[PDB]
């Protein structure tokens, strides 16, 4: 019959998910063990937290 009927809804689907992080490059301390200028001895290793 004549009139106005509500059938469904509408929704704009999104694209291009975006992830943003700050300049978190504070320390990254691996140059003291990986490529030390003078490598540590065999039995006196260096422990660096």
């Amino acid at each position, epitope marked *: 019959e004549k009139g106005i009927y509500q059938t469904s809804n509408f929704r704009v689907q999104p694209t291009e998910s975006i992830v943003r992080f700050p300049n978190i490059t504070n320390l990254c301390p691996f140059g*003291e063990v990986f490529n*030390a*200028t*003078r*490598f*540590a*001895s065999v*039995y*006196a*290793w*260096n422990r660096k937290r």
Partner: nanobody
Amino acid sequence: VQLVESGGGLVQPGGSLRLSCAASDFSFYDYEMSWVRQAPGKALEWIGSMYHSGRTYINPSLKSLVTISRDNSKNTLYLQMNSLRAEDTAMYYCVSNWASGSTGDYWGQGTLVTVS
């Protein structure tokens, strides 16, 4: 510098030479000590090393003229090299806590030596 060395000078080929560097506390020499020198135009040449008890191992390449005396109360150790040849016009160094690693050793300055 907290580590000084005494000895050297112009010596006729064949003389003797000595170096003196000392510490103060009994526990500062834990646990490894050695010696090293850098002649101009020469790479690193390790000679010998010893632990607290005094057991020594020496590089076999130049192990014929090695003699070392050690003290504990004076907190010292001496590397004595004799028969001064014409290839020792460089600077020497003694090191405390040699094996502790890259950041666990303290270096010195040495003295000039003239050889003909």
